[PDB]
Amino acid sequence: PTHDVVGVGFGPANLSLAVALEESPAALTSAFFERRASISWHQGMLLPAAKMQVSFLKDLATFRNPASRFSFVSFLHERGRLVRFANNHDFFPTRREFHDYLEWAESKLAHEVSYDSEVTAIRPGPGRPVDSVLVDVSTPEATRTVEARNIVISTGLVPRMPAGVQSDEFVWHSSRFLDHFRDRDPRSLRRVAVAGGGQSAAEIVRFLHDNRPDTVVHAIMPSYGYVVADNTPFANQIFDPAAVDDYFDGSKQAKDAFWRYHRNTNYSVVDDEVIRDLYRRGYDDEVAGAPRLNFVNLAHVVGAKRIADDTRVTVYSMAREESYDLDVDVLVCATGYDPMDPGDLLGELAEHCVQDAEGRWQVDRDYRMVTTPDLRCGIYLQGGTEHTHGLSSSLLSNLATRSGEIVSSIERRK
Amino acid sequence: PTHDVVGVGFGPANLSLAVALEESPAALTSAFFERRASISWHQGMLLPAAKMQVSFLKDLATFRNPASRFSFVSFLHERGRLVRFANNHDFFPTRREFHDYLEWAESKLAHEVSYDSEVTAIRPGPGRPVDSVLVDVSTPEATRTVEARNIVISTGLVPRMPAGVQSDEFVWHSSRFLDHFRDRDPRSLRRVAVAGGGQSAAEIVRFLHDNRPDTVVHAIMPSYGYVVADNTPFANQIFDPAAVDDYFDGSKQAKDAFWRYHRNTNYSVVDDEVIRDLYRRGYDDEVAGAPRLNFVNLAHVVGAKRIADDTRVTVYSMAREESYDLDVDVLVCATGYDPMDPGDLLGELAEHCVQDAEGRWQVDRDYRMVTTPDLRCGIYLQGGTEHTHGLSSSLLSNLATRSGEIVSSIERRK
Amino acid sequence: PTHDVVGVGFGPANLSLAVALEESPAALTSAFFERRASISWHQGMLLPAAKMQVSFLKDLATFRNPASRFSFVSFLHERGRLVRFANNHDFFPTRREFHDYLEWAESKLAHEVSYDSEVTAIRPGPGRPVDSVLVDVSTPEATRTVEARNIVISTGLVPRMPAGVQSDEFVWHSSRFLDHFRDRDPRSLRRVAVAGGGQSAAEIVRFLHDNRPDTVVHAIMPSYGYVVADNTPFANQIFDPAAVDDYFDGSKQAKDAFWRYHRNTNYSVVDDEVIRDLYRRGYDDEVAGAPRLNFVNLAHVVGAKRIADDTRVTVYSMAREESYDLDVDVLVCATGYDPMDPGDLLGELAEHCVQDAEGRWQVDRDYRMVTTPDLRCGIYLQGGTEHTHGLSSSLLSNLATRSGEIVSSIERRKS
Amino acid sequence: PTHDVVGVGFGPANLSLAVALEESPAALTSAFFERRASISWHQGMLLPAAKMQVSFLKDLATFRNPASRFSFVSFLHERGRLVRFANNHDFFPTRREFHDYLEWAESKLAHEVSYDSEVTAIRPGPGRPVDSVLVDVSTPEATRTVEARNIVISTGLVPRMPAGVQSDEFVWHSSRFLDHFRDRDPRSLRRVAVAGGGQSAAEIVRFLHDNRPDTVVHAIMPSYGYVVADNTPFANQIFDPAAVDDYFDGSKQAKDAFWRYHRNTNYSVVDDEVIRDLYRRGYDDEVAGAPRLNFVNLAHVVGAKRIADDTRVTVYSMAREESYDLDVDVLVCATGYDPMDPGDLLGELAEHCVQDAEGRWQVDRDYRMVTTPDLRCGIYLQGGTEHTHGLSSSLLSNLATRSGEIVSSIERRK
Numbered sequence A, B, D: 001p002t003h004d005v006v007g008v009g010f011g012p013a014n015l016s017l018a019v020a021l022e023e024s025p026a027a028l029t030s031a032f033f034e035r036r037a038s039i040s041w042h043q044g045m046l047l048p049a050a051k052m053q054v055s056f057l058k059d060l061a062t063f064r065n066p067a068s069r070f071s072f073v074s075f076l077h078e079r080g081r082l083v084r085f086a087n088n089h090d091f092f093p094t095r096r097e098f099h100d101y102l103e104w105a106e107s108k109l110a111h112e113v114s115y116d117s118e119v120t121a122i123r124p125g126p127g128r129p130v131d132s133v134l135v136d137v138s139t140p141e142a143t144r145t146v147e148a149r150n151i152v153i154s155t156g157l158v159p160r161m162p163a164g165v166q167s168d169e170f171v172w173h174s175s176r177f178l179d180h181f182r183d184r185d186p187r188s189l190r191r192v193a194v195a196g197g198g199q200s201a202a203e204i205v206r207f208l209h210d211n212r213p214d215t216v217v218h219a220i221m222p223s224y225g226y227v228v229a230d231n232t233p234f235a236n237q238i239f240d241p242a243a244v245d246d247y248f249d250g251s252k253q254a255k256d257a258f259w260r261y262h263r264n265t266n267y268s269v270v271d272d273e274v275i276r277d278l279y280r281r282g283y284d285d286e287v288a289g290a291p292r293l294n295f296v297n298l299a300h301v302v303g304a305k306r307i308a309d310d311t312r313v314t315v316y317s318m319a320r321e322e323s324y325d326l327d328v329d330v331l332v333c334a335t336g337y338d339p340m341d342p343g344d345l346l347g348e349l350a351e352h353c354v355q356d357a358e359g360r361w362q363v364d365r366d367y368r369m370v371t372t373p374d375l376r377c378g379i380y381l382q383g384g385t386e387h388t389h390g391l392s393s394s395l396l397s398n399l400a401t402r403s404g405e406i407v408s409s410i411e412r413r414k
Numbered sequence C: 001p002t003h004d005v006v007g008v009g010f011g012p013a014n015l016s017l018a019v020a021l022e023e024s025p026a027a028l029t030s031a032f033f034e035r036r037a038s039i040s041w042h043q044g045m046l047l048p049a050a051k052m053q054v055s056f057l058k059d060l061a062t063f064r065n066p067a068s069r070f071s072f073v074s075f076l077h078e079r080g081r082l083v084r085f086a087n088n089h090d091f092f093p094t095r096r097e098f099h100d101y102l103e104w105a106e107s108k109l110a111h112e113v114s115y116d117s118e119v120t121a122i123r124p125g126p127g128r129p130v131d132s133v134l135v136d137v138s139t140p141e142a143t144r145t146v147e148a149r150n151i152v153i154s155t156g157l158v159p160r161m162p163a164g165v166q167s168d169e170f171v172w173h174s175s176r177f178l179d180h181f182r183d184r185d186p187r188s189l190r191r192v193a194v195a196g197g198g199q200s201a202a203e204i205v206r207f208l209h210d211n212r213p214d215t216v217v218h219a220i221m222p223s224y225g226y227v228v229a230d231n232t233p234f235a236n237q238i239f240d241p242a243a244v245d246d247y248f249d250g251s252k253q254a255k256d257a258f259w260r261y262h263r264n265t266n267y268s269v270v271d272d273e274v275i276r277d278l279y280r281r282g283y284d285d286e287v288a289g290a291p292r293l294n295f296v297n298l299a300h301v302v303g304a305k306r307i308a309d310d311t312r313v314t315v316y317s318m319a320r321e322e323s324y325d326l327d328v329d330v331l332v333c334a335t336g337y338d339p340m341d342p343g344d345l346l347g348e349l350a351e352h353c354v355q356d357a358e359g360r361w362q363v364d365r366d367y368r369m370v371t372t373p374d375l376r377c378g379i380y381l382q383g384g385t386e387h388t389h390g391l392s393s394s395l396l397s398n399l400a401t402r403s404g405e406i407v408s409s410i411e412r413r414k415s
């Protein structure tokens, strides 16, 4: 049995794809595979006060269909919270609530996702021309293979550690913060270093300050202070559906300009309110004569070693041009992520995929990889399109339209 | 041809009723009569910067049906302004845009509304007990009559002038502000008095200040300064549909408590931002050495007379306990409105309508007037229920649910 | 040794006064008596996040002297926090910081305040007409009497419990919340009722929510929800120095209008940010499926009794018009305060103080009590002037000007 | 008569110097020369709604002396506007008010500034080593020379036009906008192009939009939309006096990091409120069906020519890598400024001043130019220290401390 489309991974991107498929009048068969036991949307960073970075209007479907049964508003309504929510006058739900929104949408779906199912490889199906791919799925029981005309790869961002630093028992990447943190002894983390100057770093430092009154925190970052995230209406336009076209059709020079001027809409920056809350906390501690937040500015973490009961963090100071050591209990690296890269999954097929001069994957406007003529199957990317489609690639800004264009593309070809 | 329901007036309340009728699976016949040529939603006060006092989520239908084709979001989408709107991160549309929303919703409707049609009386149909009512409609050419099993009266708020003051060519009620203003010679309104301390008074003063750089304005109000409108999330819960119950089922003592603590949510109060804008304007004028805004606090307007080229306003000062005259070109009375009273329209029918101890109409929870067995046809009120249903009666807070409850009620009895 | 002026109590008002005395070129002798061991400014309510309700510009002196050594700005500078503070862009200091500001100002003063000194009575001095008063001061060791040509009474607001409810081991007035709370065992305050819909009530409920995540709280108040405090610029003008004139010279009618329209600038109301924080808290608990905040609206606490291990709170519901019992661990009554009353302290001198029709003290514009000719000794009130001077009387809005006007009055009358 | 110190220019920087001199117990003689007839602080850009970018606490003296007779608070008090101002709860005065503050401070000063006096050169005084400088001052009547042991150069930012574009009758630099705007006839500026994406460009566009209702405006800028200014509390720390030290003592690596991460605090960025107001204006025009603001993003102005009665602006589009002509009435170039150059008055003395490797003036922390032993007189810079002291140089953030440090330095060496 050969499916019209198979989705690899089940985060928000393929969820919105599933929703788009259901709402389309086109009769398309599909299967989705998620390695984890259920939807798990950055649970390691589901901190108490964490808030979405996208407006509730930017949900699974609303921008494409303003009367979707899968809209965030529909979800508030069935939960009996729409009125309460509207009273609050906040365009930004909590991460906690949005996570519930995802699970609610998944349940509503007619079709069933296959959990505990890791896709291990994608191989060319039989014959010429190649009209199908073979998808190798590993369950905890048994391995198997499914066949599909089209495949949609949406496996998410990949944690990135500082060069020369490896994750270990007392060294964590931010993505795994709560998983480690909930599993400690509550008074065996009196000294924590957090590396990074982005949203993750800021939220973790905030949480630590708010959690235990006696934790001392070292916030280590290359800038002189947190840099504000730009979420003013015009800059935010780069996430408009039409701005995808502008980036896509634009020259390399124009693409560079988007990054030069507007990377501060998302990368290595912190939300205004979180910055102000941290600043207020620092100020009040100073007034109380009990400083706890140590901001190590203009600096990078360059190494970590466990020495007896201490995690020894090597810090490079850009001001002094020298390195030194800080001793803590745990090092949290909030040092960001690498883009989704379909390559590692593609091993058979990658040689049917065209690269550009700088060796990156060519991708069509409709998120479809560029292939050899012998490949006729569709390979679509949700994620990993930073270089072709722009800053919206890893974000929640454009779920409805992106998923819709992919579904239309697939239909247009069947 | 006897209609299931006839709507008198076509403002937002009956519009939402029309929408509720179309979305209901119940097959109900209806007709709507509006005395004006088209939807005309306080156009006299459609000032340049005027904002809705209610969230865009509080539209014609969303609270009842979160995926209505008549939602504000659907409107934005069809106009191609949903993305732009979301980027603004403002819950409050402009009055101008909301007016366009109403006209858009009216056009989408399958039913056609009858314009230029004034309802002049409502009479008992032929029968005992009465199973229908007759509805007299006057058009420019003819007069006719319509028979209905239910009526819904939604005529509006009635302009109220100060005691002992009659409107005039030089003495305007705020409701007609732009009708008189528009084409009045600019060089002829150098001195304007505005009576009142509410949202209407504040917006008019602001507009005058913004629009002619030489007008001198006297803002006359009983308070020592504008009182802020309470729109904090808890107080705003009095407009929750569950709060309608809470008022309705509550004792007279409880009802009085709503008004004594929370009338500040709507009556005789001014929006925070409008207050601050006025204050900023006054401050800057002082800095510039050119005061323009004269605030006559602890005061009321008690009379007006035209004397040669001057409108002479008699002001009573509470502080001094005396009266004095103030000469201006025009007096604008932003002195508020009276609730909608169905009584005039009913005439003949009033007698089968039950009153309470204090002489007020009794109304069931579903907005249906209490009648004597002599009457079995339904008379519903959208407006004029301040005493029975509470502060939401004249407002836009609860359109979707009240219209829905009325439609359900009519279907239930049929 | 007869002093020109004696101050009873040493809160911000009398501190203000001490500052005004020092800055005045007039050579006036003065003594201040405070019952407590040191300045103690509503310490029972010094909660972690508590913020001033008045701008830092409304400090001890700035409105009268823009370049005072006692300004809040000066304080920030000396503490090396002025630059940091400026960057925060908030006009409202924390209560904790403001408390440090007061202590700092007191230390800088050339005068020394007598602490642990309770004023127990004020008596007519010798002779007629009375040219001085005698101030009875009780210390832990001894008792003594001092003599003064003028006296300034500034003893502060007085806690007010609900009628028919008495403070106790398990029934606290908000003013003493942290006093009691810091003593009790955490696992023993699982159930708390808080009565009131004002700033105190709201702050206490937020603190409980934020500081113990398994505490259940019942917020009992007469309104349908918290009412917002009006702090918009025009309404705030009622606290302007000139508005004190406007209230004072105005008829009863106009005085009543101030209260009818603008009592919501201060009484029985809650700051916008605190309301939204509480609302956010409730919302997030509902999402998590773990409700903890129970808002009991349109209601009054009418009684409390201890029954075994439970504090039984009798609540009257206005909606239903019945009463019922609610069991908790502690009842906190955030039910407000009564105005300062110079009455009790005055005793005999009250005979020489003139009352109005409704039996209240007559007070001149300069805060001096109206007296018969048999008394020429100045009695000034900082507090307790709500009926003559208006809503600024118990607040921090007008410290600089009021203190300055009292000092000027005293000096104008010395000669 | 040899002065201890001579100030060239009398803007806020030297004004704070004059104040610092008067408050210092040191008896130092001084003279100040200003080319203009009076204090003239960017009057070309004194637009109606223009706000300070710096807090009122950052005034001429307060950070140094919290109880200065020259504080902004003292100013408000004398003008009887301290109470009113505090009620507003806005840290940012208007530019108009601040200008009045300057003039007020200048009048209070005991010292008398010499206006209409343009410094044309600074030359070494007699014999070696030079112990004084000679300052050539040109008045409308005559030219004279004064002698001084120290000199403070504070001549301000220098307007910078685009490469290939010259100011003219219909091509204006933003600095002269009001001077130019005012003579013109309203009916003659129906089409205006404004180049730039910074605070100047944004304010000018907003003013045009607000001041005429028919003007069509082309906003031409290299970014995809306005970039928000970073004004969050850690970011404002860059301007702390203690941060001057951090920048000064830091390596060249560290210095680069300040600019890389935090130039957005000031350069090529727009205040949050101004951005939202422009966005609101664009939105309402679209609703009204009358678009007037044309945002020409990802673009540069590269030439201008007058052709009959139009100004032909050549625009380069990065997106299309192409240029085209845009015809208008006036081109306003809001393309920024070039930092103060100590060097152009310096002439011969420049031989005795030390450059570094990249050819830049060496400057001591106390703002004094590094000289050979042949020069012993002090040359101080307020402005032109971007390289050595950082982003605070042209700004108002640090007037009190900078002026105080310079006064102390001069006293110390005397």
Ligand SMILES: Cc1cc2c(cc1C)N(C[C@H](O)[C@H](O)[C@H](O)COP(=O)(O)OP(=O)(O)OC[C@H]1O[C@@H](n3cnc4c(N)ncnc43)[C@H](O)[C@@H]1O)c1[nH]c(=O)[nH]c(=O)c1N2
Pocket (backbone or CB within 6 Å): A008, A009, A010, A011, A012, A013, A014, A033, A034, A035, A036, A040, A041, A042, A045, A051, A052, A053, A054, A117, A118, A119, A120, A154, A155, A156, A157, A382, A383, A394, A395, A396, A397
């Ligand atoms: C803490 C935090 C918070 C946010 C964000 C990031 C982070 C780190 N983001 C960005 C983030 O990229 C976005 O929110 C989504 O996670 C993107 O959804 P995806 O479907 O692309 O992948 P997603 O990252 O959700 O995961 C895809 C799934 O594929 C699975 N998978 C991987 N390999 C597989 C295999 N071989 N076989 C089967 N399954 C496999 C993974 O297990 C995973 O569940 C964000 N952006 C924004 O615009 N607004 C926001 O609020 C946030 N919030």
Ligand SMILES: Cc1cc2c(cc1C)N(C[C@H](O)[C@H](O)[C@H](O)COP(=O)(O)OP(=O)(O)OC[C@H]1O[C@@H](n3cnc4c(N)ncnc43)[C@H](O)[C@@H]1O)c1[nH]c(=O)[nH]c(=O)c1N2
Pocket (backbone or CB within 6 Å): B008, B009, B010, B011, B012, B013, B014, B033, B034, B035, B036, B039, B040, B041, B042, B045, B051, B052, B053, B054, B117, B118, B119, B120, B154, B155, B156, B157, B382, B383, B394, B395, B396, B397
């Ligand atoms: C300037 C201004 C602005 C606002 C508001 C009021 C005012 C004065 N309001 C309140 C206002 O009542 C509400 O917005 C609606 O107008 C109420 O709808 P009805 O449909 O109930 O009245 P209206 O909307 O007043 O409906 C009445 C209609 O009936 C017609 N009519 C009257 N008599 C008739 C007859 N005999 N025969 C036929 N037709 C007849 C009238 O022509 C009119 O069109 C408000 N509230 C809120 O919550 N948010 C807001 O933003 C605003 N905005």
Ligand SMILES: Cc1cc2c(cc1C)N(C[C@H](O)[C@H](O)[C@H](O)COP(=O)(O)OP(=O)(O)OC[C@H]1O[C@@H](n3cnc4c(N)ncnc43)[C@H](O)[C@@H]1O)c1[nH]c(=O)[nH]c(=O)c1N2
Pocket (backbone or CB within 6 Å): C008, C009, C010, C011, C012, C013, C014, C033, C034, C035, C036, C040, C041, C042, C045, C051, C052, C053, C054, C117, C118, C119, C120, C154, C155, C156, C157, C200, C382, C383, C394, C395, C396, C397
């Ligand atoms: C929790 C809280 C918080 C605030 C406020 C109230 C409360 C309850 N207030 C109002 C308050 O009234 C004001 O801040 C000061 O307390 C008033 O100064 P007095 O100096 O008038 O009172 P207090 O400040 O009450 O001064 C009275 C002193 O006299 C002493 N005393 C009493 N009897 C004595 C005796 N017989 N002998 C000697 N000493 C005696 C007392 O011990 C006390 O120290 C306020 N207002 C505002 O405008 N902004 C704000 O931010 C706040 N904050």
Ligand SMILES: Cc1cc2c(cc1C)N(C[C@H](O)[C@H](O)[C@H](O)COP(=O)(O)OP(=O)(O)OC[C@H]1O[C@@H](n3cnc4c(N)ncnc43)[C@H](O)[C@@H]1O)c1[nH]c(=O)[nH]c(=O)c1N2
Pocket (backbone or CB within 6 Å): D008, D009, D010, D011, D012, D013, D014, D033, D034, D035, D036, D039, D040, D041, D042, D045, D051, D052, D053, D054, D117, D118, D119, D120, D154, D155, D156, D157, D382, D383, D394, D395, D396, D397
């Ligand atoms: C529209 C606008 C608005 C602002 C700002 C810039 C602009 C363009 N700035 C930055 C600006 O640099 C600052 O406000 C001051 O103008 C700097 O003072 P100087 O005293 O340093 O320059 P400034 O230009 O003010 O003074 C220079 C003076 O020297 C005179 N002069 C030059 N050469 C001379 C000679 N040879 N002989 C005699 N006189 C001579 C000039 O005539 C001029 O009066 C700012 N920054 C900030 O932090 N917050 C803010 O709000 C603003 N606002």
Ligand SMILES: NC(=O)c1ccc[n+]([C@@H]2O[C@H](COP(=O)([O-])OP(=O)(O)OC[C@H]3O[C@@H](n4cnc5c(N)ncnc54)[C@H](OP(=O)(O)O)[C@@H]3O)[C@@H](O)[C@H]2O)c1
Pocket (backbone or CB within 6 Å): A045, A050, A051, A052, A053, A095, A162, A163, A174, A195, A196, A197, A198, A199, A200, A201, A203, A220, A221, A222, A223, A266, A267, A268, A269, A299, A300, A301, A302, A334, A335, A336, A337
């Ligand atoms: N509440 C939410 O919804 C939420 C929460 C967290 C994250 N997110 C999202 O997750 C995505 C990624 O955010 P992120 O914060 O996790 O990463 P970033 O990629 O946004 O964070 C990286 C930061 O660490 C710094 N860094 C790199 N190497 C370092 C080193 N050796 N030592 C110290 N610091 C170092 C970076 O500096 P430089 O880049 O300058 O070199 C940068 O400041 C974003 O889209 C973000 O919005 C969302």
Ligand SMILES: NC(=O)c1ccc[n+]([C@@H]2O[C@H](COP(=O)([O-])OP(=O)(O)OC[C@H]3O[C@@H](n4cnc5c(N)ncnc54)[C@H](OP(=O)(O)O)[C@@H]3O)[C@@H](O)[C@H]2O)c1
Pocket (backbone or CB within 6 Å): C045, C050, C051, C052, C053, C095, C162, C163, C174, C195, C196, C197, C198, C199, C200, C201, C203, C220, C221, C222, C223, C266, C267, C268, C269, C299, C300, C301, C302, C334, C335, C336, C337
């Ligand atoms: N951060 C700060 O600076 C801070 C903090 C706390 C307080 N304060 C100040 O101190 C002053 C007083 O504030 P406050 O909140 O302490 O007291 P408050 O303003 O007088 O409020 C008292 C409240 O209790 C209610 N109440 C009275 N009896 C009740 C009963 N039997 N049951 C339930 N509720 C009852 C009152 O309702 P009704 O009046 O409607 O009947 C009112 O809501 C104010 O000036 C205030 O701003 C300042």
Ligand SMILES: NC(=O)c1ccc[n+]([C@@H]2O[C@H](COP(=O)([O-])OP(=O)(O)OC[C@H]3O[C@@H](n4cnc5c(N)ncnc54)[C@H](OP(=O)(O)O)[C@@H]3O)[C@@H](O)[C@H]2O)c1
Pocket (backbone or CB within 6 Å): D045, D050, D051, D052, D053, D095, D162, D163, D174, D195, D196, D197, D198, D199, D200, D201, D203, D220, D221, D222, D223, D266, D267, D268, D269, D299, D300, D301, D302, D334, D335, D336, D337
């Ligand atoms: N209210 C106030 O107090 C106020 C008002 C105005 C200005 N200021 C201050 O004055 C200083 C300068 O502000 P500013 O806006 O005038 O200067 P600016 O910050 O340098 O802004 C210059 C802008 O023009 C752009 N640009 C340069 N060449 C261009 C070209 N050929 N075509 C199109 N665009 C071009 C720049 O782009 P790129 O940088 O990307 O190259 C930049 O966006 C700041 O300190 C500022 O805050 C204050």
Ligand SMILES: [Br-]
Pocket (backbone or CB within 6 Å): A047, A048, A049, A050, A206, A207, A210
């Ligand atoms: Br948290």
Ligand SMILES: [Br-]
Pocket (backbone or CB within 6 Å): A053, A054, A055, A058, A236
């Ligand atoms: Br968004």
Ligand SMILES: [Br-]
Pocket (backbone or CB within 6 Å): A076, A077, A079, A080, A081, A082, A083, A084
């Ligand atoms: Br709901």
Ligand SMILES: [Br-]
Pocket (backbone or CB within 6 Å): A167, A168, A171, A172, A173, A176
């Ligand atoms: Br890890």
Ligand SMILES: [Br-]
Pocket (backbone or CB within 6 Å): A246, A247, A250, D297, D298, D319
């Ligand atoms: Br483009």
Ligand SMILES: [Br-]
Pocket (backbone or CB within 6 Å): A064, A400, A401, A402, A403, A404, A405
């Ligand atoms: Br689509």
Ligand SMILES: [Br-]
Pocket (backbone or CB within 6 Å): A086, A087, B053, B054, B055, B058
């Ligand atoms: Br609302």
Ligand SMILES: [Br-]
Pocket (backbone or CB within 6 Å): B076, B077, B079, B080, B081, B082, B083, B084
């Ligand atoms: Br759209």
Ligand SMILES: [Br-]
Pocket (backbone or CB within 6 Å): B167, B168, B171, B172, B173, B176
């Ligand atoms: Br009228």
